[PDB]
């Protein structure tokens, strides 16, 4: 009956926020960092924005940049290997979900060595010790990996993404700095932006929802719906709004759950390596329609903060307005409307529906999802 | 760039103290010193926690010497008990007074150079985190469980001083209306308007930004909605108040308050006035004073406080916001004038000077002069 909230003890918000990291490291007396990132962020000079400030304050660092989209067991093991031979006593996550989730796995397994197979971390990880201290710097807007107690690792052998949930993995400090995010191509702003929206909407209507998370989620929907078109077009101010809104969504959904969008999205990541945000975006409006009659008054709120005039609308009419508002936003930021558009195969749907039913996220969905329900949703989402 | 310090872990709702035994075992702590006051031992509130700790086999000693507006003496005495207790962590059970006493003890224990206590004033230059604190509020009230601030009374200099330190943040908060139900109506009323003050002052403070604005406006809405119900003794309203007071804490701790708290602290020092009653009497008068320096923010306050602001000009809505606060104060049975609770006309000059010097006053959106604070005390005083 009582509800738990895990949050960052310390976080810095706004352009220039990464400038606070050298001070926070010195006040905690940490000796050497392993920075967990990917190739693109080294090559575009984003990592250098941090390693330059660390050089100027005389703080030692090694780099692991082997992280691929939808990080694998292989990538976790390889990164853990580098951390142990680096002599580091803390971690700095620089990137979107992929590096930040890779970083959490490494930080957990280092101080809980019985999980070295990594796949045994799935579900409520029964870890005894806190993670290696993590300092988190997101470069997408965003997975909110910096504030959530969750991370998603791809099992190549079993061809599935598995969710690990553990209060021990919470970063010590987050640095939410739109300066780190500006380099996102439009399509990445669009995808990660609707991933943030999905978190906010799924979180708002999830079974575990209560007053505090409702307050956070509805605020994040308002910020994201307001700013995402601006940000994809390349507006400085909208990009900062998105940086905050994606985080506020994290503060909610981490603590209560999401639903069938994330459940149906994870198999698409496993099977095709589909960007998490694109899969969520295509699925979100179809799953909202499916969930509609099981969400009380909450679609009125979604539609209103998304710019629709809901006064004088009936409950069912407002529920349609909320779904149409999400279709419209997807059209406007250039996310295709059908799963076949991103190479999902008609024949896989049975195996996809089964993976979706078994995914941790699906138990939070407000309408109780059957195998045949998920099959029909994939089909409706696949073509017209 | 703006910083947010929050609880890493907190539990919300009736029964939330049921999670403590689990949280202590997962952190491997051996023995607690519970910091509380006599009333909370006598009303069986402390026993609700020590019973659950007995059943899980977790050791505890108790310090119950905390008085309202905790003193340097009380901090020193409590620190003495903690060192001779063999405890390795702290459990705060009470409102601001025990929770603030507990933070001082936890800080000074691991930063022994502050044993005089009064050297903690301002941004405490502490090197080491506090002794781990687990916080259980029994008032709907100070948000001591989530803020990086604590207020200690200096008897010798006759002033309350604010200590601000990220090292004092509790590890876990337990926000449990079950622990709060035993508040007499007048205590629910006072601590409830202290929460409102935090929310309103925090909303309009100089350091305010989007995230704290979002928290504060939600807390104003919850408190304005629930406080009448809670004081009358409604179970559900008491839980709403328990959440709303906390959400206010998540904001103001990180950005600041203003001239209400600045003017309230001297009234605590001079007369031992309950913090919530002083804030309540002052709040509407300081809002009127601040009105012309708060942009559009009083529209928002008035709207979430149940006023229809759509047809209203800016100045008309600013008045509606102030009248909404007067009405709520009247309704929960708070005396409406400072003279009613024994504030003396002759002290106002010394009161105004203490207010000008208080840390809280630098956050106020309108820059306050000595003469301004003098005039505010006078207008707040009249029978
Ligand atoms: N600022 C940036 N500028 C340009 N490219 C960037 C930037 N930040 C990241 N990228 C690139 O975007 C691509 C996607 O990066 P991810 O980290 O995979 O993206 P994100 O959506 O943040 O994370 C998805 C991952 O997180 C999990 O929640 C989810 O299930 C999935 O595993 C990569 O090529 C990465 O290098
Ligand atoms: N649940 C309760 N049931 C009964 N009595 C209670 C309860 N909670 C508190 N009390 C009693 O109410 C009185 C006031 O307690 P405080 O802790 O002083 O109340 P609060 O308003 O929470 O604390 C204010 C303090 O915090 C600082 O911010 C402020 O400067 C001031 O020192 C005391 O006698 C205390 O025992
Ligand atoms: C169960 O809640 C979660 C579901 C999915 C994720 C990964 C993500 N960012 O989408 C994290 C979670 O938090 C515990
Ligand atoms: C300067 O900020 C503060 C002003 C007042 C207090 C005490 C209170 N809660 O009434 C705490 C503060 O810091 C968190
Ligand atoms: Fe996601
Ligand atoms: Fe206060």
Author numbering:
A (entry chain BBB): 2 to 385
B (entry chain AAA): 3 to 385
From the study:
Here it is shown which structural adaptations were introduced by directed evolution experiments that changed the catalytic properties of the Escherichia coli (E. coli) (S)-lactaldehyde reductase [EC 1.1.1.77]. This enzyme, referred to as FucO, is also known as an Fe2+, NAD+-dependent group-III alcohol de­hydrogenase and is involved in the catabolism of rare sugars in E. coli.
The mode of binding of NADH in the active site, including the nicotinamide moiety, is well defined by the electron density map, being the same in both structures. Also, crystal structures were obtained of the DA1472 variant in the presence of the bulky substrate analog, compound 7, cocrystallized in the presence of either NAD+ or NADH. The mode of binding of the substrate analog is the same in both structures and well defined by the electron density map. The observed mode of binding of compound 7 is possible because of the N151G and L259V amino acid changes of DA1472. In particular, the side chain of Asn151 of the wild-type active site clashes with the mode of binding of compound 7.
